[PDB]
Amino acid sequence: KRQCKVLFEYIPQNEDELELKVGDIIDINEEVEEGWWSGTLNNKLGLFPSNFVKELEVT
């Protein structure tokens, strides 16, 4: 898997976004655009801000 850890809380600003809590581990799918990744958290697929996370070593 490719994964990241949430560094800062993020309240979704839009309906297609994930809510982020510090220390959440997200399974990364792809980059939609600079700054914005899709991934899965607690069985939801959504978009999240990439500068709120730290990518982890693959493995």
Binding site: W36, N51, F52, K54
Partner: peptide, 14 residues
């Protein structure tokens, strides 16, 4: 990269 708790502008919706 430095992570900072400011989200980038979005252009692609979904």
């Amino acid at each position: 990269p430095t992570p900072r708790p400011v989200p980038m502008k979005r252009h692609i919706f979904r």
